[PDB]
Ligand binder design. Sequence first.
Ligand SMILES: NC(=O)c1ccc[n+]([C@@H]2O[C@H](COP(=O)([O-])OP(=O)(O)OC[C@H]3O[C@@H](n4cnc5c(N)ncnc54)[C@H](O)[C@@H]3O)[C@@H](O)[C@H]2O)c1
Ligand SMILES: Cc1cc2nc3c(=O)[nH]c(=O)nc-3n(C[C@H](O)[C@H](O)[C@H](O)COP(=O)(O)O)c2cc1C
Ligand code: SF4
Ligand code: SF4
Ligand code: FES
Ligand SMILES: [Zn+2]
Lengths: 67, 118, 527
Amino acid sequence: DLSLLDPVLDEYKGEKSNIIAILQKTQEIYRFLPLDALNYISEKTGVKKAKIYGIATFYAQFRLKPV
Amino acid sequence: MRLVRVNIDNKEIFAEEGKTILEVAHENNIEIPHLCYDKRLKPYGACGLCVVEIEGSPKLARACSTYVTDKMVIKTDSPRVRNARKMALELLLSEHRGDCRPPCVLACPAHTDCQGYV
Amino acid sequence: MKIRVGLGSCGMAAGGNKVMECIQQELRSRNLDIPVEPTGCIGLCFFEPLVDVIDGDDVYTYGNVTPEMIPKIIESHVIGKKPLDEFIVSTSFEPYPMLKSQVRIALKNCGRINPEDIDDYIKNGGYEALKKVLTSMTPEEVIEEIKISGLRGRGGAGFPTWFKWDAARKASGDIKYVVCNADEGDPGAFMDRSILEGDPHAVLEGMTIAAYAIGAKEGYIYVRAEYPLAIKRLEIAIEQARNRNLLGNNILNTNFSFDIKLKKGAGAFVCGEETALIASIEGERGMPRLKPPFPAQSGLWGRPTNINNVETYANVPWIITNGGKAFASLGTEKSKGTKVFALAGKIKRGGLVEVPMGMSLREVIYNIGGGIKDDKAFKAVQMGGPSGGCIPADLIDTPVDYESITKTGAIMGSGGMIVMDETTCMVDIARFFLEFTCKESCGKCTYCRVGTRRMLEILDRICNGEGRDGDLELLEELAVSVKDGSLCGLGQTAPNPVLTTLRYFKDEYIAHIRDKKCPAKQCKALI
Ligand SMILES: NC(=O)c1ccc[n+]([C@@H]2O[C@H](COP(=O)([O-])OP(=O)(O)OC[C@H]3O[C@@H](n4cnc5c(N)ncnc54)[C@H](O)[C@@H]3O)[C@@H](O)[C@H]2O)c1
Ligand SMILES: Cc1cc2nc3c(=O)[nH]c(=O)nc-3n(C[C@H](O)[C@H](O)[C@H](O)COP(=O)(O)O)c2cc1C
Ligand code: SF4
Ligand code: SF4
Ligand code: FES
Ligand SMILES: [Zn+2]
C-alpha cells in the first residue's frame, strides 16, 4: 500500500527539510522502508532519491527488510 | 584587495587575499597531496592528505580549506606532515582491494607491460 | 494534602505509572479528593517508584513504593494525618545524605514540581528572569551578565557561552536562530532527558533569554524521537507558555517575538554534533562539516545560529535572576558554577548528581556515590562516556573541572562516570567503548572511518591473546594519529579510552599480550 503515507506527506509538505520525519513515520507505519514507499516519497515530496536512501541508511533505526 | 606575504617551504610568496593554501602552492610550483579536492566544489576535508604545518598553530591545517593570511609560515614537508600523510595513506590502503600491476608484469624480471601489449 | 508521583522515564519503567493508577483508584475508593500530580526524577532513581506527600511546606518521600503498600500510606498519612516512618526514606526535616552534598541549579526544580503545569513553575519564582530581561535589561547587558557569570560548556565542550552569544548577535544577517542540543547520544547519561521531562520550562526560558540577547525570532529544540515522555512534556510546556504570552510573538506586550519548534532526530551519536545537528535539521545525513565556518557565523541555512546544551540554557535564568556574581562564586577560578553527572557502574548509589566544579572525584565517588558496591577496591572511572577516559585510582583526587579532567586525558563529555572495581579488565573496557564509537562514526574522513576499525581489531587481537609483537607501539601510534587527524570530535575523542588505558594501565596490556592472560580475569577467552 501507498495511500497510508498520504496524510504524512500532506502534513510535511512545502518544505524538503522534513524528510527524516517522513521516513520515521513510514518506518512506524510499514515497520520498514520498502523501495516502493521510498520511491513514492521521492516522487511526492520532490527530494532526490539518492538523498532519501542516504538518510534512510544513515541511521540504525531504519531497516529496509520486512520484519 | 591586499597582497598577503606568506612563506611556503622557505620560499617567500606574495599571494592574493581570499586564496587557499592549495591554490597558492599550485600557482607557485609547490606540491601538496590532495584526493578530495576539486576547484568547482566546496571543501570537504575527508582524505586529510593536504595537511600542512603552519607556524603558530598547534594542529595541522588542511591546505584545501585554510585561507592564506598575512605573515604565514607554512611547511608542507615537515616530518609531522609526512607522518600524518603516511598514516592517512596506510589507512586508505588498509581498505583497498586492487591490483596496481598484474602478476604477469611482476613475474617478468624486466617488468615488461605484459597486460599492455597483450 | 498534595500527592506527587515520580512519572519520569526512570519511574515509568520502575512502575510509577502503576503506582499512580493504584493510588488514584485507592483515593476513589475512600472518596478522598487529593490532587495527584506527576514529577520528574529527584536523583534517587534507585528508590523509585517514589511518592511524595506535601503538607504545607513539608514533603515526605516513600521509597520503593508499591501498589500493595498504597492503602497503608493513605490510611496512615492521608487519612490518619500521621507519618508512617516505616517506609518513608526522606523528608523535609532531614534530606537524604545523597542530597546534602549537592548544590542544584539546573536540577533545582527537577523532581519537586509538576512538569505539566506552568503555574507550578511560576509559583517557584519561574519566568521572573525573563521579565527582568524584558523590562529593565538590554541584550548587551545580557551578554555581559552571562560573561560575568562565567557560564560555559555543559555539553562537554567547555567553550564560553557569552562568546557564542556575542558572535551570533554581532554576525551579519537579519534572521538568526537559537537551537538546543537535547540529543543524548551517550547511553548511560540522561541529564538533559531528565531536565526536559522534569523541568522543561527552564529550557524555554533560557532559550528565550538567549534569543533576546542574540536577536533571534525562531527557535529549534533537537530532541531525540526515542524520548516520547520528554517530547510530550515539552509540547505541553510550549503550549502552556504560549497561552500565558510567555512565548510566541509579542512576549509580555513588547516588540520581542520568539517561537520554538520541535525537531525529532532519528537517533545517531554523531548527529549530536553541532554541524551534524545542523545537517540533520536541514534534512540531510548527519555528516559533520568543517568547523572554522562556525554556526555562530553560518549555521542553519547560512544564517547565524546559537547551539547550546540543555544544561547551559537551564543555568541561564538562575544567572539572570541571581546575578553573575552569585554564579561566579561557585567553582574553581577556571570553571564557574555547577555541573551535572550521571553516576553509574559499580557505584553504590547511581543517578544524577549536581556538584560544584572543583569538588574532588573521590568525594563524588565515596561521599555522594556511597562507595563501591560490595566494598571492593576502586580501579578506575570511565569519565566522559564512550569518548572519555579511564581516570585511575591514584588520580581520584583530581577536582571536577574541564581543565583538571582534560589534563588526565579524559573529557567531561556526557558527564557519565562509570565507576569500576578491580574485577573489571581494562582491555575489554577500552575495546568496549571503541567498538561503540567505531559503530557510531559517520565515515567521512579516513582517520576515523577506518582507523577506529584497525584499533578495534588490534584490541581484539590483544584480548584474545593472538596479538603479534609490536602491537602496543602500533596501537599507540594509531590512536595518536586518529586523534590528531580526524575531522570532527567523534574521531578526535574516539581513541580516548585506549590512550588513557595506555597511560595508566600499560602493564595490563603488556600482561595481556605477553603472558597471554589478564590479572582481572574478565576476558572470556583467557579465563
Ligand atoms: N555529549 C556527548 O555525548 C559527547 C560526546 C563526545 C564528546 N563530547 C564533548 O563535546 C566536545 C565536542 O567538540 P566540538 O568540536 O563540538 O567543540 P569545539 O571545542 O570545536 O567548540 C565548542 C563550541 O564552541 C564554539 N566555538 C568555538 N570557537 C568559536 C568561535 N571562534 N566563534 C564562535 N563559536 C565558537 C563552537 O561553535 C561550539 O559551539 C568534545 O570536545 C567532547 O569533550 C560530548
Ligand atoms: C560525537 C559528539 C556528540 C556530541 N553530543 C552532544 C550532545 O549530545 N549534547 C551537547 O550539548 N553537545 C554535544 N556535542 C558537542 C557539540 O558539538 C557542541 O560542542 C555543543 O552543542 C556545544 O554546546 P555548549 O555550548 O552548551 O557546550 C557532541 C559532540 C560530538 C563530537
Ligand atoms: S589498484 Fe588501481 S585504484 Fe588501487 S592504487 Fe592501484 S592503480 Fe590505484
Ligand atoms: S571523525 Fe568519524 S564521525 Fe567525525 S567526520 Fe570523520 S568519519 Fe565522520
Ligand atoms: S584534499 Fe582532502 S582534506 Fe583537503
Ligand atoms: Zn583480561
